């Protein structure tokens, strides 16, 4: 690793980035290898978490906040002379918790691309597209085709009439205020699902299918970004780039991306990556070498944007950009994108209704997703030596057992845990002291939810306080638990590679059970009786649980492999201290 490895998406001008790398090698003899693996935004966090991966990563800024909170990105500290060369708003896109975590490259915004020969007057509104499609279908052509597998391309329509991802409240994105299932979101998605049902589009259209059909003159319109103009030029189709159509009188609001280059925190060539990006790529000569391969958009480098801003296609990119919103860079963006992706794919295929698709996305958009959990998960698994495959087998087993015996619906805990000051109790030393604080606090009518770890069951019975929820792996004294379970307590049973025995044993004899697993696949495994809210120990898992179900504020009242679990606990508890009030007792 005496050289530079660079990762950028396959739809970008990586050949042009290689040209810059060749010049870097020419002057410093440092070989530069540009790669474009599939799903690089998801592969990088995995390879980087261990110390592997490229030296420089390229992607829209929206993923970089999750990379930084995981500690995967070195902090960039360019001289003020260099920062002044880039627009300040592009720097803001890559600032996370006051630290710049990447170099901004170019502003990406989707635009409407139309065939002038097939359609010299592109439509101004979505509503008039169905009439245009049947009209074009009389000539063997379609009106519109674009990638329906990535929510990036359908979000402009979903957001036109009021849809939003996370409310921007008082200078901060409120991860609790998600707007993917409000009136506007449903309206936008419905119009898109109607387009499929009415045969104006196919739910199967993906990137390649849409690009092929448009560049072959089969469809009159597509929706894509500046990177796609290069292939359209080669296809000889006479195209134009214009403003996206309006929906219900309101403009389409595409999430605007800023292509950014992050430096791997484990890379041993940090200073080399710094000089390459600052002195080779982010120059008029360097950005253009990339731009002539595949257009970047509105570049962040001021000197080079003055020339591109004259291009009418770039003019439309910014007009569409000004009507949308720069994406957040917060770590929860990964969860939002998965939620919307699944909702669209499910509502498009008809396999699920628009109402239920968005309602499911609403829950899991703000819910912690297995993206910042992949980091903690495997870190804990090999640190203790747990068998990753056994966490699978136990999670699956737990699910099948709950399919036919004595379940409680998830939203009944949502009935308890919401807008309330939930009490979380571990088996700590001050349990009796803090339980005394709570009792005299509950004795005065401040009677709000109570979630307790397994080892605290008997510690609560003795004061005749029946916990509302109990998080347990069914390891120790189960008698105290069982008594609580029928006096009202809901039991959240957690799957453990070392607990598969007692799962099959004690579960069927319990009432009011909800499933838990640590495994991060499960959603892809399509397990519907278990859930991974996040967390390692019963204590911290209680916190993820209350958080997962929209709890206002947490209130807590609780051989090295015993000391090392208490560290992951505080590690994971501090993780949520920036997402929910966490007042200790
Ligand atoms: O579809 C969700 C996806 O949207 C964006 O991905 C864009 C990216 O910004 C573009 O530069 C280019 O790579 O096309 C992608 C669409 O497939 C977000 O940047 C990305 O995080 C998100 O998952």
Curated annotation (Swiss-Prot):
Any Pfam family matching the protein: SBP_bac_1
InterPro entries reported for this sequence: Maltose/Cyclodextrin-bd (IPR006060), SBP (IPR006059), SBP_1_CS (IPR006061)
Disulphide-bridged cysteine pairs: none
Record key words, sorted: Periplasm, Signal, Sugar transport, Transport
Top-rank taxon: Bacteria
Compartments reported by the entry: Periplasm
GO cellular component terms listed in the entry, alphabetical order: ATP-binding cassette (ABC) transporter complex; ATP-binding cassette (ABC) transporter complex, substrate-binding subunit-containing; maltose transport complex; membrane; outer membrane-bounded periplasmic space; periplasmic space
Keyword Cytoplasm tagged: no
Record-linked PROSITE patterns: SBP_BACTERIAL_1
Keyword Transport appears in the UniProt entry: yes
GO molecular function: carbohydrate transmembrane transporter activity; maltose binding
Induction details: Induced by maltose and the transcriptional regulator MalT. Permanently repressed by cold shock in a PNPase-dependent fashion.
Main subcellular location: periplasm
Database matches in Gene3D superfamilies: Periplasmic binding protein-like II (3.40.190.10)
PANTHER family referenced in this protein's UniProt entry, alphabetically: MALTOSE-BINDING PERIPLASMIC PROTEIN (PTHR30061), MALTOSE_MALTODEXTRIN-BINDING PERIPLASMIC PROTEIN (PTHR30061:SF50)
Similarity annotation: Belongs to the bacterial solute-binding protein 1 family.
Subunit structure: The complex is composed of two ATP-binding proteins (MalK), two transmembrane proteins (MalG and MalF) and a solute-binding protein (MalE).
Protein name from the UniProt record: Maltose/maltodextrin-binding periplasmic protein
Native species: Escherichia coli (strain K12)
Gene that specifies this protein: malE
């Amino acid at each position: 690793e005496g050289k530079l490895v660079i990762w950028i998406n396959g739809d970008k001008g990586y050949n042009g980035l290689a040209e810059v790398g060749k010049k870097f090698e020419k002057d410093t003899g440092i070989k530069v290898t540009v790669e474009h693996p599939d799903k690089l935004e998801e592969k990088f966090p995995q390879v980087a978490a261990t110390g592997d991966g490229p030296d420089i990563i390229f992607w829209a800024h929206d993923r970089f906040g999750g990379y930084a909170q995981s500690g995967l990105l070195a902090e960039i500290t360019p001289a003020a002379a260099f920062q002044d060369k880039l627009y300040p708003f592009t720097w803001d896109a890559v600032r996370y918790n006051g630290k710049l975590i990447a170099y901004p490259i170019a502003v990406e915004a989707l635009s409407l691309i139309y065939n002038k020969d097939l359609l010299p007057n592109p439509p101004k509104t979505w509503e008039e597209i169905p009439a245009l499609d049947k009209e074009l279908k009389a000539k063997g052509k379609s009106a519109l085709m674009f990638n329906l597998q990535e929510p990036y391309f359908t979000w402009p329509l979903i957001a036109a009439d009021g849809g939003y991802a996370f409310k921007y409240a008082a200078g901060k994105y409120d991860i609790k205020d998600v707007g993917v299932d409000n009136a506007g979101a449903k309206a936008g998605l419905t119009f898109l699902v109607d387009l499929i049902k009415n045969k104006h589009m196919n739910a199967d259209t993906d990137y390649s299918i849409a690009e092929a059909a448009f560049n072959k003159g089969e469809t009159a319109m597509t929706i894509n970004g500046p990177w796609a103009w290069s292939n359209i030029d080669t296809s000889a189709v006479n195209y134009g780039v214009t403003v996206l159509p309006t929906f219900k009188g309101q403009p389409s609001k595409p999430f605007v991306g800023v292509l950014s280059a992050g430096i791997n925190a484990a890379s041993p060539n940090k200073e080399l990556a710094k000089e390459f990006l600052e002195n080779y790529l982010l120059t008029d000569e360097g950005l253009e070498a990339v731009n002539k391969d595949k257009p970047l958009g509105a570049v962040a480098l001021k000197s080079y944007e003055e020339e591109l801003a004259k291009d009418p296609r770039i003019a439309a990119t910014m007009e569409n950009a000004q009507k949308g919103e720069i994406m957040p860079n917060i770590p929860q963006m990964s969860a939002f994108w998965y939620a919307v992706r699944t909702a669209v794919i499910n509502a498009a295929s008809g396999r699920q209704t628009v109402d239920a698709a968005l309602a499911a996305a609403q829950t899991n958009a703000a819910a912690m997703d297995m993206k910042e959990w992949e980091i903690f998960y495997n870190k804990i698994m090999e640190d203790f030596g747990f068998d990753k495959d056994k966490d699978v087998e136990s999670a699956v087993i737990l699910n099948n057992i709950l399919e036919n015996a004595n379940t409680i619906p998830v939203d009944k805990l949502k009935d308890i845990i919401e807008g309330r000051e939930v009490f979380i109790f571990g088996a700590g030393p001050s349990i009796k002291k803090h339980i005394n604080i709570l009792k005299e606090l509950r004795e005065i009518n401040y009677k709000n939810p109570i979630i307790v770890a397994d080892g605290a069951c008997k510690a609560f019975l003795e004061e005749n306080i029946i916990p509302d929820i109990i998080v347990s792996d069914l390891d120790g004294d189960l008698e105290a638990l069982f008594e609580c379970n029928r006096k009202g307590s809901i039991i959240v049973v957690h799957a453990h590679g070392d607990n598969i025995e007692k799962i099959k044993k004690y579960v069927p004899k319990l009432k009011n059970v909800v499933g838990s697993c640590q495994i991060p696949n499960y959603k892809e495994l399509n397990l519907r009786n278990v859930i991974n809210f996040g967390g390692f120990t019963d204590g911290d898992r209680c916190c993820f649980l209350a958080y997962h179900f929209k709890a206002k504020k947490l209130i807590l009242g609780g051989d090295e492999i015993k000391i090392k679990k208490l560290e992951y606990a505080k590690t994971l508890i501090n993780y949520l201290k920036d997402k929910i009030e966490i007042e200790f007792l």
